[PDB]
Amino acid sequence: LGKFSQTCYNSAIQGSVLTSTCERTNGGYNTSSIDLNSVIENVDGSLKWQPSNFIETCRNTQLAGSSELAAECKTRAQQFVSTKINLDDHIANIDGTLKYE
Amino acid sequence: LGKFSQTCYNSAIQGSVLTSTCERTNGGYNTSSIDLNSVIENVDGSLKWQPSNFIETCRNTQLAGSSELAAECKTRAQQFVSTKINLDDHIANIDGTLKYE
Ligand SMILES: CC(=O)N[C@@H]1[C@@H](O)[C@H](O[C@@H]2O[C@H](CO)[C@@H](O[C@@H]3O[C@H](CO[C@H]4O[C@H](CO[C@H]5O[C@H](CO)[C@@H](O)[C@H](O)[C@@H]5O[C@H]5O[C@H](CO)[C@@H](O)[C@H](O)[C@@H]5O)[C@@H](O)[C@H](O[C@H]5O[C@H](CO)[C@@H](O)[C@H](O)[C@@H]5O)[C@@H]4O)[C@@H](O)[C@H](O[C@H]4O[C@H](CO)[C@@H](O)[C@H](O)[C@@H]4O[C@H]4O[C@H](CO)[C@@H](O)[C@H](O)[C@@H]4O[C@H]4O[C@H](CO)[C@@H](O)[C@H](O)[C@@H]4O)[C@@H]3O)[C@H](O)[C@H]2NC(C)=O)[C@@H](CO)O[C@H]1O
Ligand SMILES: OC[C@H]1O[C@H](O[C@@H]2[C@@H](O[C@@H]3[C@@H](O[C@@H]4[C@H](O)[C@H](O)O[C@H](CO)[C@H]4O)O[C@H](CO)[C@@H](O)[C@@H]3O)O[C@H](CO)[C@@H](O)[C@@H]2O)[C@@H](O)[C@@H](O)[C@@H]1O
Ligand SMILES: [Mg+2]
């Protein structure tokens, strides 16, 4: 997994946002960033990769109305159930960019 | 917090990724995406927001060479220590975009 660096150049971190420029699979070069705020966690002073089971345990995601996200997710009993969450609660538009806050 | 849909339009969800076109503070629009895999999680079938603490308990982050992220983070005793994590562990280039796997 990961390894992004081998095919990216000119990466910068600022605050918690990583930005880098990376080879498109065939052809061009894209510059993109990802906010680490949500992939990294501090545990008693050490940076740890923070896990989430969303993708792994949920399915059929779809946007309802303007902000609601819907999916079906495995209950601890391995059963799929319906479920939704209002993306409006914490996804904000910060000067044109969607941001988790 | 949040309320992106008040000032964004033409939104979509593909897998766990959300895309939308949002108003810059004053001026035009920008179309960004945000990967929701590390932003919410599935608890016994119900979706919830995944909190984190990187932003609120570490400070002065820095890029170290190719892929190494460095910072100072707070410990269970309440003191800051240096700490690093190799971003190459789980940050991959996916066809020009940075993704967390
Ligand atoms: C310089 C000069 O010459 N000025 C002259 C003035 O006479 C006059 O000034 C104003 O210009 C503004 C600029 O556009 C006018 O339009 C807009 O309004 C606001 C202004 O932001 C300021 O207030 C923000 C807080 O607002 C809270 O309270 C007010 C009512 O009192 C309401 O709007 C809300 O209910 C809101 O409540 C929320 O906030 C509390 C905190 O107390 C929080 O606990 C709760 O969550 C609660 O829900 C404040 O946040 C903001 O900070 C900015 O100010 C400075 C920079 O100047 C920095 O310190 C900050 O970092 C930041 O830049 C101001 O103090 C503002 O909302 C508008 O900008 C938004 O929209 C853009 C897209 O269109 C987007 O790009 C921005 O990033 C921002 O987007 C956010 O909001 C939209 C919905 O509006 C949402 O869909 C997005 O997801 C995004 O979400 C965040 O938005 C707010 C905070 O920004 C939060 O509510 C959300 O939870 C979330 O965090 C824009 O500036 C303004 O009306 C006008 N005069 C006024 C207002 O009296 C101008 C005329 O324009 O003329 C000059 O001559
Ligand atoms: O160990 C890395 C981790 O993720 C790997 O997937 C990413 C991969 O990037 C892809 C890579 O493949 C290109 C295509 O196959 C193309 O058809 O062939 C060329 C060879 O000439 C490949 O470059 O490279 C492109 C551009 O460089 C990239 O856009 C693709 O997504 O490998 C890079 C290496 O840094 C990494 O960022 C990603 O991991 C995955 O394959 C696997 O090794 C791991 O799960
Ligand atoms: Mg997370």
- A57-90 core/surface letters (b: 16 or more CB in 10 A; e: else): bbeebebeeebebbbbbbeeeeeeeebbbbbbeb
Q: Give chain A's radius of gyration (CA, Å).
A: 17
How many angstroms does the Cα of residue B15 sit away from the middle of ligand 2? 20
Residue with tokens 């949920």: A58
DSSP assignments along A33-83, one per residue = EEEGGGTEEEETTEEEEPP--HHHHEEEEEEETTTEEEEEEE-TTS-EEEE
| Min distance A23 CA to chain B CA atoms (Å) | 5
- Is the C-beta atom of B29 inside 6 A of ligand 1? no
Chain A hits for B51, Cβ within 8 Å:
none
Chain A hits for B68, Cβ within 8 Å:
none
Residue from B93, B97, B100 whose mutation best tests the ligand 2 pocket (most atoms within 8 A of CB): B93
Residue B97, token pair as written in the block: 């975009």
- Tell me which chain B residue has its CA closest to the CA of residue A34: B98
- Is the C-beta atom of B25 inside 6 A of ligand 1? yes
- Tell me which chain A residue has its CA closest to the CA of residue B53: A41
| Min distance B41 CA to chain A CA atoms (Å) | 5
Three-state secondary structure string covering chain B:
CCCHHHCEEEEEEECCEEEEEEECCCCCEEEEEEEHHHCEEEECCEEEECCCCHHHHEEEEEEECCCEEEEEEECCCCCEEEEEEEHHHCEEEECCEEEEC
A53 within 8 A of A44, measured Cβ to Cβ: no
Residue A36, token pair as written in the block: 């680490």
Domain chopping of chain A, boundaries: 1-101
CATH of the domain spanning B1-101? 2.30.60.10
| Length in residues, chain B | 101
Other CB atoms within 10 Å distance of the CB of residue B82: 10
Method used experimentally:
X-ray
Give the experimental resolution in Å: 2.5
**Ramachandran angles phi, psi of B38, nearest 5°:** -105, 15
Question: What SS3 class is residue A5?
Answer: helix
Residue with tokens 């503070």: B25
Other CB atoms within 10 Å distance of the CB of residue B15: 11
* Residue A60 C-alpha from the chain's centroid: 17
B41 within 8 A of A74, measured Cβ to Cβ: no
